[PDB]
């Protein structure tokens, strides 16, 4: 039934405008949808002149660009446009004292403090948006200063500050604002970005912002003008949280823990505010996760469902603080479930907005997500919520699909259940769901005990471990089975969600009789690798393995390939599978493939005073700078493990030529000399394009040598070991469509599967020491030799030598 059309807008900022809803992103992103299923951009990005937003980006912006997010420090080479927000204000006086404008709040920023908030304005939804004023400032210092790559002054007196002061909005410069050395003390005080504009009871306009360091702050503002009331006087809350003159009153964070993208509702309903913020990290390993408060007063004090306040008492953990509202999740679709692919889940899912409609009630989270198993590939999602007994709107497990609440009979509600539980904590990890089920004597029973009810048309009370959690019972689109189902959604007092879907009714035979006709272990016919032998199926269904031949495969998937030449070799590996007395068996062939020589294909020695290849079917190299792309450093060859080494300073490498690797079936063998290790620093790199790159990393993300693949999906070829300086260590690494290994000095130190092939049919970008965004490599490498094909165990331990 339903459809969907996807977008990529990163930290959408909801809107609706007549009938038609739309979304502001960060990168100058945006897109409409009449229905929250089906996007459509209508943006084109940092392209300028004729940005759709902006128009002349650099001229329009200009004010908030000399401060940060052109071209200087983290922006270097194009532009940091973030975060925006977007409404309609009635009261806003234009140039020609018309009165009513759509108004964008938007951010720049330049390093993880130096930021701005400006706003611009416009007749139309779909802009031209004029700038009107930069407002807040962040980065800036005591006395003049600048950062790396930047010409821009971050003293004080180069902000807004001054002509404040001027206007007798401030009385001066807080000493507070600087740490003894000058530098902007973002402990207690905030970067400028990510502003989110609402209203309040009365319709009084607010701006709360935020990005971690000292946290999120609100401030009242102009609806006439868009520009702040700052509060002129430091201070406190009546109930002790910090109000600066300037930056407005704290309502979040603290103590450089993290929380932004801040979103505030007021719900007249329930006559609450309702605080949403995103703790963690945005990238695929940051546990981005979403994270819900409330107040009484637009201005906080902002509590969760146990009472603790948003801002945190200390340079802590934020762990605790904040209803989880929804983190990394997966309903794996195991082997038996309906459907392809392996089942719908989110990663750092976040940076979310808020549509509340004034008549209907019916309110929808808004966010974008990453997705398990293609790295920082991101989409915008939207799932309805719905308001619980206790003043809290719960978030519906799926992404909305034309449901609404409905009257919700006890037999459509009983039954099995997958279900997953959000705690609290974060990180990487996904959470996956467990199997229970409701039974018609309102008991809980499976992996979890305890009790539930239906309450009215569909509130939902669910109570596992002594936990109690109340939410709603509503129908929900599983795209993984293509039905509707049952599910429910439900909040506990510690502020912890539990998710619900119902399984389709099914006996033991059944089951089985499913994991049996879904049982694959794909193509066994050209085996190179290990099988995974899956040892559960779903609902807890149990299957067990045996091997005709040990000696080609083992019980639990281990290959044992053949010499090279030799016959490739048969197995037969039978599964049985059973849950309670239903049982069935299926069989499957192996064929384990020899080992295969890989043949020389280029030859990168260093012997004859050049970047030749010696083989002479590559052009030579040539000479780069510190990345890739660039050009001027300097080559020295110095004394190596065979003939001349290359050697490369600190400050360049050697871009090899394109099209170096060319397939699925390739290897690379070097030695390193290094002197300093450097975290991200590639030997050999890599790269279709800067999002989908292979890099021989001697010091990676883990502190240790690995294979690195990234960014969609991300690859994670870990050794274990690190690797010695002013010393040779030889490397080698092999792919063999999916099948990847590494060898630290001949022995095999990574073997695993799923490698992302990056350069089949295309003529992709190789280098030595540099890629796009690392210190380059310092010391030797000496004979780089690249080979088509998988080398062999064999071919290794003697390059080795
Ligand atoms: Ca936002
Ligand atoms: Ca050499």
Same mark, same amino acid.
């Given at each position: 039934?339903?459809? %969907?059309?996807?977008?990529?807008?990163?930290?959408? $900022?909801?809107?609706? #405008?007549?009938?038609?809803?739309?979304?502001?992103?960060?990168? *100058?992103?945006?897109?409409?949808?009449?229905?929250?299923?089906?996007?459509?951009?209508?943006?084109?990005?940092?392209?300028?002149?004729?940005?759709?937003?902006?128009?002349?980006?650099?001229?329009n912006?200009?004010?908030?660009?000399?401060?940060?997010?052109?071209? #200087?420090?983290?922006?270097?080479?194009?532009?940091?446009?973030?975060?925006?927000?977007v409404f309609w204000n009635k009261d806003y006086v234009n140039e020609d004292g018309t009165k009513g404008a759509y108004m964008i709040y938007?951010?720049?920023?330049?390093?993880?403090?130096?930021?701005?908030?400006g706003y611009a304005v416009s007749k139309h939804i779909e802009g031209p948006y004029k700038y009107v004023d930069?407002?807040?400032?962040?980065?800036?210092?005591?006395?003049?200063?600048?950062?790396?790559?930047?010409?821009?002054?971050?003293?004080?007196?180069?902000?807004?500050?001054?002509?404040?002061?001027?206007?007798?909005?401030?009385?001066?410069?807080?000493?507070?604002?600087?740490? /003894?050395?000058?530098?902007?003390?973002?402990?207690?005080?905030?970067?400028?970005?990510?502003?989110?504009?609402?209203?309040?009871?009365?319709?009084?306009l607010?701006?709360?912002?935020?990005?971690?360091?000292?946290?999120?702050? &609100?401030?009242?503002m102009d609806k006439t003008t868009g520009k702040?009331?700052?509060?002129?006087?430091?201070?406190?809350?009546? #109930?002790?949280?910090?109000?600066?003159?300037?930056? !407005?009153?704290?309502?979040?964070?603290?103590?450089?823990?993290?929380?932004?993208?801040?979103?505030?509702?007021?719900?007249?309903?329930?006559?609450?505010?309702?605080?949403?913020?995103?703790?963690?990290?945005?990238?695929?390993?940051?546990?981005?996760?979403?994270?819900?408060?409330?107040?009484?007063?637009?201005?906080?004090?902002?509590?969760?469902?146990?009472?603790?306040?948003?801002?945190?008492?200390?340079?802590?953990?934020?762990?605790?603080?904040?209803?989880? *509202?929804?983190?990394?999740?997966?309903?794996?679709?195991?082997?038996?479930?309906?459907?392809?692919?392996?089942?719908?889940?989110?990663?750092?899912?976040?940076? /979310?907005?808020?549509?509340?409609?004034?008549?209907?009630?019916?309110?929808?989270?808004?966010?974008?997500?990453?997705?398990?198993?293609?790295?920082?590939?991101?989409?915008?999602?939207?799932?309805?919520?719905?308001?619980?007994?206790?003043?809290?709107?719960?978030?519906?497990?799926?992404?909305?699909?034309?449901?609404?609440?409905?009257?919700?009979?006890?037999?459509?509600?009983?039954?099995?259940?997958?279900?997953?539980?959000?705690?609290?904590?974060? @990180?990487?990890?996904?959470?996956?769901?467990?199997?229970?089920?409701?039974?018609?004597?309102?008991?809980?029973?499976?992996?979890?005990? +305890?009790?539930?009810?239906?309450?009215?048309?569909?509130?939902?009370?669910?109570?596992?471990?002594?936990?109690?959690?109340?939410?709603?019972?509503?129908?929900?689109?599983?795209?993984?089975?293509?039905?509707?189902?049952?599910?429910?959604?439900?909040? @506990?007092?510690?502020?912890?969600? *539990?998710?619900?879907?119902?399984?389709?009714?099914?006996? #033991?035979?059944?089951?089985?009789?499913? &994991?049996?006709?879904?049982?694959?272990?794909?193509?066994?016919?050209?085996?190179?690798?290990?099988?995974?032998?899956?040892?559960? !199926?779903?609902?807890?269904?149990?299957?067990?393995?045996?091997?005709?031949?040990?000696?080609?495969?083992?019980?639990?998937?281990?290959?044992?390939?053949?010499?090279?030449?030799?016959?490739?070799?048969?197995?037969?590996?039978?599964?049985?599978?059973?849950? +309670?007395?239903?049982?069935?068996?299926?069989?499957?062939?192996?064929?384990?493939?020899?080992?295969?020589?890989?043949?020389?294909?280029?030859?990168?020695?260093?012997?004859? /005073?050049?970047?030749?290849?010696?083989?002479?079917?590559?052009?030579?190299?040539? *000479?780069?700078?510190?990345?890739?792309?660039?050009?001027?450093?300097?080559?020295?060859?110095?004394?190596?493990?065979?003939?001349?080494?290359?050697?490369?300073?600190?400050?360049?490498?050697?871009?090899?030529?394109?099209?170096? &690797?060319?397939? /699925?079936?390739?290897? &690379?063998?070097?030695?390193?000399?290094?002197?300093?290790?450097?975290?991200?620093?590639?030997?050999?790199?890599?790269?279709?394009?800067?999002?989908?790159?292979?890099?021989?990393?001697?010091?990676?993300?883990?502190?240790?040598?690995?294979?690195?693949?990234? $960014?969609?999906?991300?690859?994670?070829?870990?050794?274990?070991?690190?690797?010695?300086?002013?010393?040779?260590?030889?490397?080698?690494?092999?792919?063999?469509?999916?099948?990847?290994?590494?060898?630290?000095?001949?022995?095999?130190? %990574?073997?695993?599967?799923?490698?992302?092939?990056?350069?089949?049919?295309?003529?992709?970008?190789?280098?030595?020491?540099?890629?796009?965004?690392?210190?380059? %490599?310092?010391?030797?490498?000496?004979?780089?030799?690249?080979?088509?094909?998988?080398?062999?165990?064999?071919?290794?331990?003697?390059?080795?030598?």
């Amino acid at each position: 039934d339903p459809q %969907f059309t996807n977008v990529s807008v990163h930290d959408p $900022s909801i809107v609706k #405008d007549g009938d038609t809803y739309y979304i502001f992103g960060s990168h *100058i992103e945006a897109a409409k949808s009449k229905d929250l299923m089906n996007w459509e951009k209508f943006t084109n990005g940092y392209t300028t002149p004729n940005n759709k937003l902006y128009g002349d980006l650099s001229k329009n912006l200009a004010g908030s660009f000399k401060w940060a997010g052109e071209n #200087d420090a983290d922006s270097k080479g194009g532009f940091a446009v973030w975060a925006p927000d977007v409404f309609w204000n009635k009261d806003y006086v234009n140039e020609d004292g018309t009165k009513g404008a759509y108004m964008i709040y938007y951010s720049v920023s330049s390093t993880y403090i130096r930021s701005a908030i400006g706003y611009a304005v416009s007749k139309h939804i779909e802009g031209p948006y004029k700038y009107v004023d930069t407002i807040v400032y962040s980065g800036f210092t005591k006395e003049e200063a600048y950062d790396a790559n930047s010409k821009i002054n971050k003293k004080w007196t180069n902000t807004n500050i001054p002509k404040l002061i001027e206007q007798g909005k401030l009385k001066g410069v807080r000493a507070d604002w600087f740490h /003894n050395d000058g530098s902007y003390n973002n402990r207690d005080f905030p970067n400028a970005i990510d502003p989110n504009l609402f209203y309040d009871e009365k319709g009084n306009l607010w701006m709360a912002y935020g990005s971690w360091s000292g946290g999120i702050f &609100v401030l009242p503002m102009d609806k006439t003008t868009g520009k702040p009331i700052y509060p002129g006087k430091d201070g406190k809350t009546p #109930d002790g949280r910090l109000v600066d003159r300037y930056f !407005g009153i704290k309502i979040a964070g603290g103590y450089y823990q993290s929380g932004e993208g801040t979103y505030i509702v007021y719900d007249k309903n329930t006559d609450y505010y309702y605080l949403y913020v995103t703790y963690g990290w945005l990238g695929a390993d940051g546990g981005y996760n979403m994270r819900q408060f409330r107040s009484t007063s637009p201005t906080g004090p902002y509590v969760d469902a146990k009472g603790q306040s948003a801002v945190l008492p200390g340079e802590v953990d934020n762990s605790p603080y904040g209803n989880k *509202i929804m983190g990394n999740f997966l309903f794996e679709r195991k082997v038996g479930d309906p459907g392809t692919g392996i089942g719908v889940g989110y990663v750092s899912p976040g940076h /979310n907005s808020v549509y509340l409609d004034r008549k209907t009630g019916q309110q929808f989270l808004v966010f974008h997500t990453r997705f398990p198993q293609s790295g920082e590939y991101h989409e915008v999602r939207v799932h309805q919520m719905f308001m619980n007994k206790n003043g809290w709107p719960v978030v519906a497990p799926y992404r909305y699909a034309g449901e609404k609440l409905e009257k919700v009979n006890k037999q459509d509600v009983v039954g099995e259940y997958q279900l997953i539980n959000h705690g609290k904590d974060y @990180s990487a990890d996904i959470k996956k769901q467990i199997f229970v089920r409701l039974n018609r004597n309102n008991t809980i029973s499976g992996d979890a005990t +305890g009790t539930w009810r239906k309450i009215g048309h569909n509130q939902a009370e669910i109570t596992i471990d002594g936990e109690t959690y109340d939410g709603v019972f509503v129908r929900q689109w599983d795209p993984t089975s293509k039905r509707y189902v049952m599910a429910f959604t439900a909040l @506990s007092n510690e502020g912890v969600s *539990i998710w619900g879907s119902k399984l389709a009714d099914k006996t #033991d035979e059944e089951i089985v009789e499913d &994991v049996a006709s879904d049982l694959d272990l794909g193509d066994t016919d050209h085996v190179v690798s290990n099988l995974h032998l899956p040892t559960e !199926g779903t609902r807890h269904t149990v299957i067990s393995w045996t091997t005709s031949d040990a000696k080609v495969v083992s019980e639990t998937g281990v290959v044992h390939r053949p010499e090279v030449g030799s016959a490739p070799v048969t197995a037969t590996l039978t599964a049985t599978i059973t849950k +309670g007395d239903a049982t069935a068996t299926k069989v499957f062939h192996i064929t384990v493939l020899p080992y295969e020589e890989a043949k020389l294909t280029a030859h990168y020695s260093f012997d004859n /005073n050049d970047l030749s290849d010696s083989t002479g079917n590559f052009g030579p190299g040539t *000479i780069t700078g510190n990345r890739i792309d660039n050009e001027g450093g300097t080559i020295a060859y110095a004394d190596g493990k065979i003939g001349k080494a290359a050697v490369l300073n600190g400050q360049s490498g050697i871009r090899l030529p394109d099209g170096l &690797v060319s397939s /699925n079936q390739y290897s &690379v063998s070097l030695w390193v000399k290094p002197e300093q290790l450097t975290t991200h620093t590639t030997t050999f790199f890599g790269a279709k394009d800067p999002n989908h790159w292979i890099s021989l990393v001697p010091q990676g993300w883990d502190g240790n040598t690995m294979l690195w693949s990234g $960014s969609s999906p991300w690859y994670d070829g870990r050794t274990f070991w690190k690797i010695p300086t002013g010393q040779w260590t030889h490397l080698a690494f092999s792919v063999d469509n999916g099948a990847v290994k590494v060898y630290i000095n001949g022995v095999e130190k %990574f073997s695993g599967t799923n490698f992302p092939d990056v350069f089949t049919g295309a003529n992709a970008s190789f280098a030595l020491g540099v890629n796009w965004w690392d210190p380059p %490599f310092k010391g030797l490498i000496d004979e780089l030799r690249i080979y088509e094909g998988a080398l062999t165990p064999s071919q290794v331990t003697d390059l080795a030598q």
